[PDB]
Every structure is written in C-alpha cells, then in structure tokens.
Design a protein around this motif. Structure first.
Motif, PDB file in Angstrom:
ATOM      1  N   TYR A 120       0.843  -1.194   0.000  1.00 23.23           N
ATOM      2  CA  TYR A 120       0.000   0.000   0.000  1.00 23.23           C
ATOM      3  C   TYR A 120       0.878   1.243   0.000  1.00 23.23           C
ATOM      4  CZ  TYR A 120      -3.067  -3.575   1.995  1.00 23.23           C
ATOM      5  OH  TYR A 120      -3.792  -4.726   2.221  1.00 23.23           O
ATOM      6  N   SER A 167       1.000  -0.338   7.102  1.00 23.32           N
ATOM      7  CA  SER A 167      -0.142  -1.068   6.558  1.00 23.32           C
ATOM      8  C   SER A 167       0.288  -2.314   5.791  1.00 23.32           C
ATOM      9  CB  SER A 167      -0.982  -0.151   5.664  1.00 23.32           C
ATOM     10  OG  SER A 167      -0.223   0.303   4.560  1.00 23.32           O
ATOM     11  N   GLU A 177      -7.257  -3.422   5.143  1.00 24.03           N
ATOM     12  CA  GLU A 177      -6.040  -2.644   5.405  1.00 24.03           C
ATOM     13  C   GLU A 177      -5.925  -1.424   4.499  1.00 24.03           C
ATOM     14  OE1 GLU A 177      -4.011  -2.806   7.991  1.00 24.03           O
ATOM     15  OE2 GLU A 177      -5.043  -4.594   8.760  1.00 24.03           O
ATOM     16  N   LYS A 193      -8.430   1.098   5.924  1.00 26.31           N
ATOM     17  CA  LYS A 193      -7.942   1.682   7.174  1.00 26.31           C
ATOM     18  C   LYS A 193      -6.894   2.765   6.939  1.00 26.31           C
ATOM     19  CE  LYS A 193      -7.043  -2.186   9.530  1.00 26.31           C
ATOM     20  NZ  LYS A 193      -6.907  -3.129  10.699  1.00 26.31           N
ATOM     21  N   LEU A 194      -6.032   2.547   5.953  1.00 23.03           N
ATOM     22  CA  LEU A 194      -5.026   3.538   5.610  1.00 23.03           C
ATOM     23  C   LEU A 194      -5.696   4.791   5.064  1.00 23.03           C
ATOM     24  CD1 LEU A 194      -2.131   4.419   5.461  1.00 23.03           C
ATOM     25  CD2 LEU A 194      -1.980   3.355   3.191  1.00 23.03           C
TER      26      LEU A 194
END
Ligand SMILES: *[C@@H]1O[C@H](CO)[C@@H](O[C@@H]2O[C@H](CO)[C@@H](O[C@@H]3O[C@H](CO)[C@@H](O)[C@H](O)[C@@H]3O)[C@H](O)[C@H]2NC(C)=O)[C@H](O)[C@H]1NC(C)=O
Ligand SMILES: *[C@@H]1O[C@H](CO)[C@@H](O[C@@H]2O[C@H](CO)[C@@H](O)[C@H](O)[C@H]2NC(C)=O)[C@H](O)[C@H]1NC(C)=O
Ligand SMILES: *[C@@H]1O[C@H](CO)[C@@H](O[C@@H]2O[C@H](CO)[C@@H](O)[C@H](O)[C@H]2NC(C)=O)[C@H](O)[C@H]1NC(C)=O
Ligand SMILES: *[C@@H]1O[C@H](CO)[C@@H](O[C@@H]2O[C@H](CO)[C@@H](O)[C@H](O)[C@H]2NC(C)=O)[C@H](O)[C@H]1NC(C)=O
Ligand SMILES: *[C@@H]1O[C@H](CO)[C@@H](O[C@@H]2O[C@H](CO)[C@@H](O)[C@H](O)[C@H]2NC(C)=O)[C@H](O)[C@H]1NC(C)=O
Ligand SMILES: *[C@@H]1O[C@H](CO)[C@@H](O)[C@H](O)[C@H]1NC(C)=O
Ligand SMILES: *[C@@H]1O[C@H](CO)[C@@H](O)[C@H](O)[C@H]1NC(C)=O
Ligand SMILES: *[C@@H]1O[C@H](CO)[C@@H](O)[C@H](O)[C@H]1NC(C)=O
Ligand SMILES: *[C@@H]1O[C@H](CO)[C@@H](O)[C@H](O)[C@H]1NC(C)=O
Lengths: 491, 491, 491
Positions: C339, C357, C431, C434-435
C-alpha cells in the motif's frame, strides 16, 4: 465554555487472556473460556449409571461361574468395571473370539441365569477338578456341567431345548481338551470325541485337541468356551459322543446402554454423566483430553490440552480499525459497560456506558457460546481402544479407526476456536465502530472527528446536551448556527 | 424546490424465513433453501441402475441354485434387492463367513456360471434330496453335484481344473455333515470323510462331524458351504475320500459398481441416481436424513432433519450497521432489485433499483450455492450398517465406523450452514454500505447525510439530476456554488 | 500551485494467480501458494528412516529363513520395502492369517533371532528338501527345524521353554502336510501326526492333512505356518507325535515406529521424512495427492490435485469496497510495498510505500500460513490400503474406513482454502480502507475525498508537507484557514 469534547471508547482489564486466531497465534482478549476438560477427580461416580465393580472378577469369570465370583450371579450393570488385578482361579480355559463374547455380554448388561432341565442320560454329571477349588475341595464352574463316562460307557448324547419364550437365550458351553490319548479314553471312552451344538439355522461343530500343556493349578488339560444364541421359536440341539462341557441353562439377553470398562479408579458416591478409566469428568465443556475411552454423555476426545474461546473483545491497556486502531486505548475504569462515552464540558467531565452496543456484543458472544458449549455427545458401548495382546490385522484396524476419528475431531476443535476467536475480535471492533458512526451521524455539521475516537463539538454543550447525544435525541438544528460560526466563521 | 432528498434502501418481504447463524439461533432472512433431503417416494426407480428384484430368493440361494430360484440363473445386477420374505427351500446349509461370500458375489454383480468338464471317477453323481424338491421329484442345488458311493466303494477323489483364462474363477463347493453313522456309511462308505480344496497358493481342508441338527424339511444333516477363487495360471485341485459336495463349474467374477441392499420397497419405472432402502431420493441437496444405507450418487447422511441456507439478506419489514442499522427499514415495495434509491425533488417522488449492487449480492450468493449444492458423492458397494444377529467384535467396529462418519458429517453440515448464513448476512449488509458510501462520495459538498440512509441534497435536483447520481455521472462542480450557498450562505 | 493531490493505492502485478473463495470459483490474487503435494522424485530417500530393501525377499521369507534370504538374518528396519518381483524358493507353505503375522513382524521392526536349548530326543533334526536348495545341496528354512524319524522310531516329543526374561518372545513354527500316506509313514512312522503348541494362556493343535496339492518346486505336500507369543513368566510347550516343523528359538519383539510398504521405487541417498510407494515426497505442504499409502511425517492425502491458498490481495491491473472498489486500480510500479501514496504538487509528482499497513497485511497472512502449513501429521504402521485378493467383509471395512477418512479430509482441505481465501481478500481490502481512513482523519477540513481513493488538498502542500501526512505528523491547524478558503472561499 464554547466547545466540548466527546470521546468514544471501550473497556479494558488489567489481566487479559491470550487466545489463538486465524491470523495470530497469540493475541490478548479481555475474557476467555476453556473448551478442553483436562482433569479428573480420579474416582468413578456411582450415579446416575449403575456401576458394578468387578473387583477380582473378570466378566468372563463371573459369567462362567468361577467359584470366587459367586457373588456376581444374576448381577446387572450399566457399566461393569474390570480391574487389572482380577484373576481366574478355576479350570484353565480359553475362548476362541474371547473379545466378542465379552463384548456381547457387556452390552447385554445382565448375568441373569435360568437353570433348565437338560436330561443327560447315561453319563456321570457335575465333574470337578483340583484346578477349581472351593476351599480344599475340588470344584468347577457353577454354570457348566462337566460330563464323563458312567461305568464303561459314554453314550451318544442327543438333546434339545426349545426356546418358547419371547426373549433371546444365550447358551455358554465348552469342549474339554485332554492331555493324552489315555485320558481321552478314560474320561469319554471314545478315542475321538466331537461336540455339535446347533439351532435350526446355525451350527458349531468342534473336535477336542490332545496334548500335554503347561500345568495350571495342577492341570495340563484345557477347556475351550463357545456360545450360542437361541431366538424365540428356535431350538437348541446338543449332540456329542464325548468331551462336552454342558450348559446348565441360559442367560437372558437384553439390549440397552450397558458396557464394560477397564479401570483401577475407585468408585465414589457422587454424580457424573461422563466416565473415563481415569475417573468421572465434568461434561460442561465440548472437548476433553483425559481419555479416548469414555462412557456416557462426554466431551469429545481431542489431542489438545487447552483450547481457549474468547468471550470478550481485544484487551488494550480488527477489520474495522476502531479497537486497537483509531481508538488508541481501552478504559479500565469503565466497569458497567463494554462501550461508552467520556465528555469534557463547562460543567466538568464524566463517563457513561452505552447499554445498547454493550448488549449487542454480549448477545452475539452468548450466541456462539450457546452453539459451542451445547452438550451433544452421548456414547455407550463402543469399540475397545487399548489392547493387552498383539493380534495383527483386526487390532491394526480398530486402532486406525480411533486414531482417524481423534485426528479429525482435533482438527475441528482447533479450527472452531481459531475462526470463532477471529470473528469475536472482529464483531467487537465492529460494535465500537458502529457506535462511533452513529454518534458522528447525530452531530451533523456541529462537530469534527479529532481522529482518535473523539469529537470536538463546536458549541456550548452542557450535561443535558451531552445526554441528548448519548440517548440519541440530539437536535443538531438547535446548535447549527453557533457551531458553523465556530467551525468556519459563518455569520 | 431548492433542495431534494435521496434515500438509500434495500428490499424486504412480508414473511421471511428463519435461519441459524454463528451468533444467532434464529434470524429472519428474505429467502432460504433447504439442504437436507428428508423425503422419499417410497419406491426404487429402475433407472439408471440395473435393479434386480430378488423376490423370494436371497442372493445366496440364487447363487447355489435353490430350485425356487432357477429364474435367477446367470443374472446380473448393479443392485440386487433382497426382500425380507425370502426363504430357503433346499437341503439345510450354513456358510462359514456367510457375510463375506454374499459381499463378494454382490460386488461382482453377476451369477454367470460356466459348467466345466469335471471327471469324477468311481462315484455316483447328481445326488438328490427330499428336502429340495423340484415339483414332485427330489432335487438339489443346481450348481452343486452331490457325489456318493458307487457299488460298495467310494474312492479317493483327486481331480484338477487349471485356469487357462485371464480372469479369476469363483468355485463354490460344500461338505456334508451327515446326521448319523448309518447315513455317513450309506452315502460314503468311509466312517469319516474329508475334503481338501487347494491351489498353488491356498488350501482348505474340512473334516465333517456326524451328528443330529434340528430337522429341516425332513433332514437332520447339514451342508457347509465354502469357496475358492482361482487366479489366472493357477490350478484347482480337489481331493476327497467322502462327503464332498462338488462344484459343477465356476462363477465369473467382475469388478464394477455392483452391490446388494435389503429393502421391501417396490420397484417403479422412473429415473433416480440415488437409492435407499426407503426408496429412491432426489440428489439435488448435499445432505439427507432418510437412511444411512445408500447406493449411487447420493446426498450425505446427516442427523439433522433440516438445515436452511440463507439465500437473501436479513429481512427487516450486520458488521457494517447499514441493514437493520442506520437504514431503519427494508422496502417491501422494492421489487425489481435488492438495493436502490428513493427520492423527493422538484418533480415529485420516485424509486429505482441499483443493478450493480443487486447483481453483486446475487452473484456472491449463487457462488456459495453452486459450491454447497454441487453433487460430489457417489458410493456403491460399502459396508453393511444394519444387522440381524448379535456377533460382537467385527459388528461393534462396523457400527462404530459408521456412527463416527455420521457424527463428523453432521458436524460439517451444521457448521457450514451457520458460517455461510453469518457471511451472507454480512456480505449483503456490506453491499448496502458500499452503495451508500459510493453515493456520498459522488455528492461531495453538495449534500449532507441525514443519518438514516438519506441525503439532503442542497440544490435544485430534477429527475435528470437524480438519474445522474443513480448512474454515476453526477457532476458535483455544476451545483457546488448553489449547494454551498444553501448550506453555509457563502454568496 | 494552490492545491495538491494525494492518492492512496495498492500494488498489482501483471500476471496474478487464480484462486477459489467462498463466493467465487475463480478470482485473481497477486500471489498464492500450493497446498497439495502432487509430485515425487520417484525415489525413496534412505534418511532419516532406516530403510531395508527387501529385494527379492518378502518379509515372510526373510522371517522363516528362505535360503535366498540369508542376508536378512537379524535385520532391523523402520521401513521394510517389499518388491513385486520377490519370490519364494523353498518348500511350499501357507500361513493362516498371513496378513496378521506379516503386520506384527513389520510393526516389531526386527528379525533378531535367539537360538534356544530345545532338545529333540529320539528324532533326526535338520531335515532338508530338493524344493529348497542352497546351491546344489538340499536345504530348508534356516529358522525352522524339520524333524523326522531316527531309525525306525519317532517318539512322542514333549518339550518346554520357559520365558525367564523381561520381554516378549515370538515363536514361529510349522506343520508338515505330506502328499501321500507313504511319505507320512516314511518321515514320521505314525500314520497320523499332531502338533500341539501351548502356553498357560493359549493352545493350538494342528492335525496334518495328507493329500496332493498342486506341485510347487517338485512338491505336492505343504507346510502350514503358525506363531505363538510367550510373555515373561509364561512357558512354551511343544508336544507332537509327528509332522512338527520345530522352531529353533524365538524372534525378539519390540514396539516402535516400524512398518512395511509395497513399492518398486529405487532407494537412493537423500533425506525425506515422508515416504510413499511412488517415492519420497516433501512435507512442506499440509496436503498431498500422490498416494494414500504413506509412512512418516507426511501431508494428508486428499482427492484434489491442486489447492491454491491466496497469500496476497486481489490483483487489479471485498467487504470494504476499497480494493477493486473506490480504488479503481492497482499500481504495478509499486514494488517496495503493498500500500502507499502517490502525489502531485508544486514540486512535481512522487510515490512512497506505506510500511505499517503493508506489514500489518503481511503479518496477518504469514500468521495464517504458519497455522495452515504447520507440519502436524506423522503416522507409521497403519492399515493396508491396497489388496491383491478378494476377501469380503474385513477388506470391505478396511476400504470403507480409508475412503471415509479421505473424503472427510478432502472436505476439510476444500473448505479451509475457500474460507481462508475469502478472508485474505477481505483483510487486505480492510487494510487499504484503514489507511485511507487514517489519512482522511489527519487532513480534517483541509482536504476533500475525490471519490477514487484520492484527496484534493486545498492548500499549498510541498514535499515536506506531503511527507508529514505520510508519516502521521501533519498539523492541520497550520493550513486550516488557507484550506477553508480554497474550499468555500471562507477565509
Ligand atoms: C508469494 O507467497 C509465498 C508464500 O508466502 C512467498 O514465499 C515465502 O517467502 C517467505 C519469505 O521469503 C519465506 O519465509 C522464509 O522462509 C525461510 C525458510 O526457508 C526462513 O528462513 C525465512 O526467515 C522466512 O521465514 C517462505 O518460506 C516462502 N514460502 C514458500 C512456500 O515459498 C513468496 O515470497 C511470495 N512472493 C511475493 C513476490 O510476495
Ligand atoms: C468471562 O466469560 C465467561 C464465559 O462466558 C463468563 O462466565 C459465564 O457467565 C455467565 C453469566 O454469569 C454464566 O451464565 C455462564 O454460565 C458463565 N460461563 C462459564 C463457562 O462460566 C464470565 O462471566 C465472563 N466474565 C466477565 C467479567 O464478563
Ligand atoms: C511333558 O513335559 C512337561 C514339562 O516338562 C511335563 O510337565 C511337568 O511335570 C512335572 C511333574 O509331572 C511338574 O512338576 C511340572 O510342573 C510340569 N511342567 C509343566 C510346564 O507343566 C509333563 O509331565 C510331560 N509329559 C509327559 C507325558 O512326559
Ligand atoms: C436327536 O434328538 C432330536 C431332537 O429330539 C431328534 O429329532 C426329532 O426327531 C423326531 C422323529 O423324527 C421328529 O418328529 C422331531 O421333529 C425331531 N426334532 C428335532 C428338533 O429335530 C432326533 O431324531 C434325534 N436323533 C437321533 C439319532 O436320535
Ligand atoms: C492328483 O492329480 C494331480 C494332477 O494330475 C497329480 O499331480 C500331477 O502329478 C504328475 C506326476 O505324478 C506331475 O507331473 C504333475 O505336474 C502333477 N500335477 C499337479 C497339478 O500337481 C497328483 O500326483 C495326483 N495325486 C494322486 C495321489 O494321484
Ligand atoms: C489417564 O490415564 C492414562 C493412562 O491410563 C494417562 O495416559 C493419562 O495421562 C491420564 N490422564 C489424566 C488426566 O490423569
Ligand atoms: C430463493 O432462493 C432459491 C435458491 O437460490 C431460489 O431458487 C429462489 O428463486 C429464491 N426466491 C426468490 C424470491 O428470490
Ligand atoms: C426410512 O426407513 C427407516 C427404517 O430403516 C426409518 O427409520 C426411517 O424413518 C425411514 N425414513 C423415511 C423418510 O421414510
Ligand atoms: C503413485 O502411484 C499410484 C499407484 O501406483 C498411481 O495411481 C499414481 O498415479 C502415482 N502418482 C504419482 C504422482 O506418481
């Protein structure tokens, strides 16, 4: 007094529990419960199952009627407990397919014996032996009748016994194997004996075996034991010209939950549904690591010694990134709920648990607990799983079947706990995020997300105002002008 | 006319279906499907498997050639159906390891019998019995040859039959146990007979025992039946000084899908891949609760009578908190999609389904349906699972193996449905949330989330404008000034 | 130059791997790993297990001491490898319950033989046969002692051998079946012999059967092989008036990990814990499709030829709707992370991987890999799973047990991979989301979500500014006034 802070959070505890999940072999939750029963008291509870302690009597010896086993006459059991110290003290014998007779009697659960009027014309009855003493006197199995010649003759015996009852009869009988040709002729006259025991649809026909064998209680001869089941409307026939060890009658057969277990555990007055050779064990858990041999309503045997099921959220002293995420930290001082609010305003600070979100998480966790912890395993007579003698093919297979079963259930238990734990952590993270989102939605344009689970509320928000947010009745329109002026400088 | 409302929602139905999940024992979804087959027609379909109705003939009697069983000569089957009314009507016999011979013939699937040119020097052939009548005449098993003395002599028989073929031959033969010495000597001269059947790799020797067994069709003697398989290149040798019940030839052996089943269900003209003793059952479901005894492509036997798989979203007349969450309520009036939009604008009100989100949920659910209900279980000859007699050890093991299997599959089925249902509820909640979020993102600063799945759009938004949002082509820049002015008073 | 763009993204690769999930039978991920071992080198590695190549000797012939098998005297093995070309070259024999004796010797893992002080008074020892040559001279099984008459007499043999040791002894012995009465009398004087072998707890009496069997190496007679185990404190007795093929001593019995395997694969120098008849296979995978017959620490046999476990995210050249969702597209030019961020500002463009992440996703995936591929299956002596002769009931059961096991593990393997893959796709989607959310939260009122994973930052944001966002130290207060202006024109 022109702004307020409202922070969302979740509880935490000083000592959590480490559990396993799909992605982490070690992760701390607030609470967990053990799914593997790993201890026994070491005693067999005598209720609710009828326990019969065999003491120094093997079931086979109680069946035949070895004299030291007379107290077991007509006994019944749900579980016959066979002690390793038990020994035989009568005429030396063997049972072709011993395991099957032991099994079928154990499963029948009774030694109820009915004497029948067999007529044995032309022979001497009630033979006795120095191998089978009652005190100093020669004796013999109580349920067998050792026939020998009368005078110089042993006639062709040919007798019948009809089953005119409505239950099955079990007949146990034998063939005597003398040590020498001379003994054969001395006892039975005929040089080659033969015993044929039959029903209308089945037969067993046996010839005696001659030869010197090691002395057992003074005797080199042996008896081999056989059995015959006679159904209602069928008949027993016995035909022999020598070597017959006759039945005295039949055992009633029953069907039900009876079995037999090898154990040296003492019997105690207490209650337990589940029995192992190590002793009774509680059945509140779905799994156990005490013994693969069990009787009754028992947890399933698995290889693991511990499997911990999470019953609370992650402990922070997830897919949604709230718990152990944008919320840095759990609250140990929140003891009346799992989730809640802290606030800071003109009137001071405070904390309140959120009932609805707490209850949602608890209800979901109880749901899986109820599914998992539901007692569903009750087995009685099964297969043997430990063996005293080497046998080869059949024993290889019995062992392989049980090993296969255990490995599959150990797999199920391991996966179950890992999946359930991952989901418990994710659903509790979810409930935290949902409460945050609901609060965000109430506030509309009057507040900003500070990024740490807290909202900065851009207007005067006293205790009653804070309570309106907590109880879902906040009216954003009331404060909008004030808030927009503070956030953006609008008026 | 200066603002509009756009609401997101999902369908609902007046009466949903209760299913089970990981966290909830009862939860209502829009639609579900049954995974356990619990019914049979009560009849065995005669296609696609070759069904042979045994009628009043047990396979063993069709094999030996009981006179009432002549119509079964040279028959073949995929499934031999054995009826409980079948009876024997020939010389009384027993088969040591009866179950094994029945099994191997059943599995072979043919009674094709090849008569061979055996030479029996010095004996009388084709012995016959009043226990085995053909019409008014005494008779005997068609496939056996009862040899007796010729004149005053019964010679030592010594005969061979090499297997020069490339297939295995099954020989079935017998040994006669006469009732008396008079019968023995009358038939065979010798006071004690003997049969030895051997090949290069095997030997079987049986010495019969004389004695009375119960009278059956006038006869107190018995024949015991044995069998010998002769491999290509090997040789059958038969050696006897009396009591031989000789084979007339061999049975062909095959391998394939053949078996045998005990059933009293009638045969019908229809098609069904799966057969149970209760009758044929459909195999569209992955599980069944009709009978553990099956033949063909069948659902797996489980203990449960019903297992409902969710095939729709939660019914509201989740991890993401949209369905049964911030969206209060499903829409029963939404019938052309699972998710969609309602609006109120200058032109009135309206509703439109969102195809992409609807299709995404449907494809994912069809995916698991295809995976779950995919027919993958086809079994033919297996082990027996019901028993007419007590036997002990081997039967204990057969029963335990099957009970173990059923408990493991019942577990798999229960878990599968609970996991799948929990996931279906969550993925449908997810699709709702994703559609809401996509819409929010399009609107940028031109709308506010009202908190109930609805957006207040802060500009005049006619039907074409609404459709641009629904079809993902909304240009937020066009309306931004108007919208910011209404929200904040910027102009 | 008054604004900047910051886009969040994830990596992608040009050619991904197709895997199966709960909802999709085919979906592309960046990386996957195979869980089913489907290949062998075709050779059995000679370490770490002690492999004994039987060559042209079946274990049974090595046991008895067939003259071509002398090199196997006192051998030991963890795995005896039995070749299809092995042949017997001694007196023709058969072993009632051959499979059991083969099994128990194989499991014992030794042919250690101890000669004992048997005294055979009045007979000729060391009988030999032209069927059993050692070079040009007649010979016999090395571990057996063929007794015949001495002069004109074969007396009643009556001998004992006590077990005064603390281990179990295995005695293997035989009975000669002569082809003719002439041979019987020539060898043993008595017209009918008898062999009785007994202990205190067991007895076997074998009566020889005189008669022709098919000629094997010039012999129409046969020897039958039997065995007897004598425990510490028990006594062996042998009593016979003819036809005894005597033991010379005992084989020492052990318990442990030894077994036997039928294979024609060559043995070579290498290391492998897992052995199959096809050759050794690596045990790094949890499943294998090479052979159900295995020995050692082996992957579990399943029916599938391939099962691919996702070890990376969805490949785009989920529940959360980021990957293959609002982020249209993966970045192939991202090689140092999973990411990250791309940006466009006054100073130009740029790219940076997000470490935290990326690592969170990798750690979770490695967690499930460690759980899944963890070697936990080690089996030694088991049941036979392939068979050369039709046998019926016991073989049906052995086959059914193995088939049941395989179908259950195949099920477990299929479900595991479908569930894990679905979860991997979802956690990697999580993930990414969330980032995005963390970045959104940092930016506060200073940026707007463009709807495609990109933020429009409404202020001058140079390289240092971008880097503060990427490293989590962005100070929104510094830029807020400038930003609100560009956004609404408010400052
Ligand atoms: C695609 O996925 C596979 C499976 O995860 C990756 O292969 C794995 O790569 C890791 C890292 O190189 C290996 O872990 C290492 O193993 C050795 C033991 O040999 C250990 O000493 C190291 O410290 C580390 O733990 C792992 O063994 C390996 N697994 C397999 C089956 O090859 C692969 O790297 C991935 N490819 C990409 C481009 O991401
Ligand atoms: C920790 O988890 C256990 C497991 O659920 C909880 O113990 C249960 O408590 C409920 C409520 O009193 C009882 O109905 C159950 O019988 C208990 N189960 C067991 C296995 O004991 C316990 O209450 C939890 N602890 C906290 C502080 O929440
Ligand atoms: C066959 O051999 C056995 C063993 O030597 C003899 O049995 C022993 O007999 C003596 C006295 O007769 C006993 O004190 C021993 O205890 C016996 N030993 C065992 C192991 O039983 C037996 O007498 C011999 N038979 C013949 C006919 O000679
Ligand atoms: C052995 O005893 C049986 C049983 O009493 C005798 O069989 C009976 O014989 C009579 C006369 O033929 C029949 O009417 C009965 O039906 C028979 N009963 C059964 C159960 O078979 C048999 O005849 C006797 N045998 C000898 C040699 O004496
Ligand atoms: C029983 O018959 C078999 C078959 O003819 C005889 O065995 C054959 O004997 C000849 C010479 O005697 C050998 O060359 C053959 O190889 C033997 N054939 C087989 C299959 O073994 C046997 O000798 C006969 N026995 C008696 C007692 O007559
Ligand atoms: C139960 O007994 C067996 C041996 O009989 C032993 O291996 C096991 O450790 C015992 N378990 C407990 C909990 O005592
Ligand atoms: C309910 O689900 C089943 C299984 O997919 C399907 O055949 C049926 O058409 C569904 N009904 C509706 C109204 O969607
Ligand atoms: C099928 O037959 C068995 C009898 O063996 C019975 O127990 C069961 O209830 C029957 N099931 C159905 C659906 O007819
Ligand atoms: C392994 O051997 C079995 C039996 O000979 C064969 O069916 C199978 O195809 C072989 N597999 C491989 C990978 O060699």
């Amino acid at each position: 007094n022109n702004t307020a802070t409202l922070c969302l959070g979740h509880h935490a505890v000083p000592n959590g529990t480490i559990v396993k999940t799909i992605t982490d072999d070690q992760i701390e939750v607030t609470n967990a419960t053990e799914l593997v029963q790993s201890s026994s008291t070491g005693k067999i509870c005598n209720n609710p199952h009828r326990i019969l302690d065999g003491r120094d009597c093997k079931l086979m010896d109680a069946l035949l009627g070895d004299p030291h086993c007379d107290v077991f006459q007509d006994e019944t059991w749900d579980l016959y407990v066979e002690r390793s110290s038990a020994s035989s003290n009568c005429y030396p014998y063997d049972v072709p397919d011993y395991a099957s007779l032991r099994s079928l009697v154990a499963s029948s659960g009774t030694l109820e014996f009915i004497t029948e009027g067999f007529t044995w014309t032309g022979v001497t009855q009630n033979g006795e032996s120095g191998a089978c003493k009652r005190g100093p006197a020669n004796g013999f199995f109580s349920r067998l009748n050792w026939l020998t010649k009368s005078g110089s003759v042993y006639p062709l015996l040919n007798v019948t016994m009809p089953n005119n009852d409505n239950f099955d009869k079990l007949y146990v009988w034998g063939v005597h194997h003398p040590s020498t040709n001379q003994e054969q002729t001395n006892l039975y006259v005929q040089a080659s004996g033969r015993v044929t025991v039959s029903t209308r649809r089945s037969q067993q026909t046996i010839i005696p075996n001659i030869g010197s064998r090691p002395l057992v209680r003074g005797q080199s001869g042996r008896i081999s034991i056989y059995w015959t089941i006679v159904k209602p409307g069928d008949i027993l026939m016995i035909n022999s010209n020598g070597n017959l060890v006759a039945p005295r009658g039949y055992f009633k057969m029953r069907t039900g939950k009876s079995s037999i277990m090898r154990s040296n555990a003492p019997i105690d007055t207490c209650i337990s549904e589940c029995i192992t050779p190590n002793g009774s064990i509680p059945n509140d858990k779905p799994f156990q690591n005490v013994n693969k041999i069990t009787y009754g309503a028992c947890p399933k045997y698995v290889k693991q010694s511990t499997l911990k099921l999470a019953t609370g959220m992650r402990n922070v002293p997830g897919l949604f990134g709230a718990i152990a995420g944008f919320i840095e930290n759990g609250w140990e001082g929140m003891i009346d709920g799992w989730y809640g609010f802290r606030h800071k305003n003109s009137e001071g600070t405070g904390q309140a648990a959120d009932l609805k979100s707490t209850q949602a998480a608890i209800d979901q966790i109880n749901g899986k607990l109820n599914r998992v912890i539901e007692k569903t395993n009750e087995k009685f007579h099964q297969i043997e799983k430990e063996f005293l003698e080497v046998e080869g093919r059949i024993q290889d297979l019995e062992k392989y079947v049980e090993d296969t079963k255990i490995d599959l259930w150990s797999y199920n238990a391991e996966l179950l706990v890992a999946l359930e734990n991952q989901h418990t952590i994710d659903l509790t993270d979810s409930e935290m995020n949902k409460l945050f989102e609901k609060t965000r939605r109430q506030l509309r344009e009057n507040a900003e997300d500070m990024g740490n689970g807290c909202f900065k509320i851009y207007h005067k928000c006293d205790n009653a105002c804070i309570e309106s947010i907590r109880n879902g009745t906040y009216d954003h329109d009331i404060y909008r002008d004030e808030a927009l002026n503070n956030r953006f400088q609008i008026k």
